[model samples]
Target: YESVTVEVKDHVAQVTLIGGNAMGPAFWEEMPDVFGTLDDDPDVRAIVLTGSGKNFSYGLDAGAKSRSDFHKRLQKMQGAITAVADCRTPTIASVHGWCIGGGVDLISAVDIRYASADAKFSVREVKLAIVADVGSLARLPLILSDGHLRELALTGKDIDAARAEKIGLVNDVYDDAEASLAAAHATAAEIAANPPLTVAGVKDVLDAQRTAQVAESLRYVAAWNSAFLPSKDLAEA
Candidate 1:
């Protein structure tokens, strides 16, 4: 059940999503190990995270479930996204269409984000009455301003590629999905061409500030939800 695909070459690793390009049980199940393994591989100096099919992600599976189990599951999923941020090898998120909710969470943790003209991004959890308990609320603050992040999360507003680049949420916009992925690969190749250890050091230093903040906030979010997440509003969405 490999929901994410990995390929390493030219000192760059490409991770493409599968399983309907949705984050669900198997997605989380395979995430930590896949990225962690890539982080450990000396051959993988840089990595690009992207989607399969037309969309970056359809977001979290609507089937995501339960109370007590929700707590444990949330912990693992958060760890999965954290794994993306924690990797020693730098990461680039190449987004295409409909990157909503958990899709935003997934990309927010990457070192860089690139998008296609068709890319649509949103912090959509609020529509379902759930505060984003994953990496978005915590990791996003480092990349986005207080107002920008709050507005997206609060209103669940969808922003197109130009707006994403304008707010500095993404580095650049491309003509299409493959173009965006090629752009990500170009940047990743440049990173890989740099002194590998030095590149890792830069990533380590930058992520240092958010590492503690993100971990603490993520735990608090999971704790808050475990104690109070309502099942009714979630299903109503």
Candidate 2:
């Protein structure tokens, strides 16, 4: 059974990860295409990612799990995580319940993050008795403190939504999962209503600014909107 489900509503794409004790090769292999659809769709302006059940995700099914090949498993798992990070459509994670292990990696790629009050988060590779080889090591430095991140990465301690907000890991907190998701939908709508070219250009520029060459990024900003600068959408908006 596919563990992930995607629904597109009013130009906003919503993704839900399911089947969830942990994520392995099977789940990972399907995620790139699942997450990448929004990036490819001309109509989809933004995306919302979330999880089902009592946990956002457990990372890997480290307990009582048997995979025929470890290398294949790693490839698949890495594929999904990387796809989420590299996807062009802006993502907003609607986090709830226990967001552990690989969960951090999934949400870290999102441009915005909102969580339910009951949400619990951790970089659980340490508790699993291994190093985090997924997206966490790369994205965590930009979002969390070196010392605080080290404490969590080293110890695998859980942080609730309130603490996540305090530490600047989450953008907002809501009373429940549904409310959080509603807020996410509203935010996506706001982004969708804005000029599409401008949104895409801004996302490109901000992401480029994160890694290298601000001058080159400005060039990208121009390239992103060359066709849309004086287009009807811009005029209408």
Candidate 3:
């Protein structure tokens, strides 16, 4: 099944997560390809990513098969999320419903985040007996402070759209799903109209400022999770 759909119109590409909107093998495999295509396409000047159904993403799918080196496997998945940040075009995340675990990682990589008032987010790997390794730990610090970020990661608690905006997790929150997506598209259209070279240059410089730090942190967390992922709490939770 296709895990995503892309529609390009007037310099804006709307990238929507389809299927169950879970970050599974299919998701990991397709993410880099999706963003890379938009990055290379001169017509697609800006990208707006969202979920197709009620939620933005349910995070990691509720399944796994670790037959290979766990660290290697995690690094591969982390690369998928990293592609969002690596893309040259600016990306916006329009989140509704639940954005959990890896979903937060995906949004963290995007340049801007918008949400519906009903949206919820969590860094919930702690409850699953795992550190969030994909990209959340590495990228979220850019959008949020250590205090708020640590609280969410440590508690595995859900925060509403209001709280998300308060902590800089989301740039704005709309009244509902329809409005949230509308705002995202409008913002992307505005960005797309600016001079292409300068826009890319600005995005490039801002990313270059901290991309190395995030990359190394991602490597460290991937190694840590490989070694410490499983425990007594894992089986029960």
Model 2, stretches more than 4 Å misplaced?
A: 62-76, 211-237
User: What lDDT does the true structure give each of the candidates?
Assistant: 0.80, 0.72, 0.81
Clashes in model 3: which pairs? none
Q: What is the C-alpha RMSD of each candidate to the true structure, in Å?
A: 3.0, 14.2, 3.0
lDDT of 3: 0.81
Q: Per-residue lDDT for 59-112 in model 3, tens only?
A: 788124472467677788877777778777888888889887777877777778
Backbone clash total for model 1 is 0
**Cα error of candidate 1 at position 125, Å:** 1.0
TM-score quality measure for candidate 2: 0.80
Model 1 poorest ten-residue lDDT run? 61-70
lDDT of 3 at 32: 81
What digit string (tens of lDDT, one per residue) describes model 1 on residues 1-237? 368777778888788888747677787787788777777858788888888888878788833455768788888877777777777888888888888788888777777888889888888788888877988888777788888877887888888989889888988888978788888888888887789888778877876665677678988999898876777877887
lDDT of 2 by residue, 13-125 (tens): 77777766477666766777676656886978888878888668877762223332444454456556667666667888887788777777778878899988998887765
For this target, which candidate reaches the highest TM-score against the unseen true structure?
3
Error of 3 at 1 (Å): 7.7
Candidates in descending TM-score order? 3, 1, 2
Highest lDDT scorer: 3
Answer with 1 or 2, whichever has the higher TM-score.
1
- Model 2: residue 59 alpha-carbon error in angstroms: 1.5
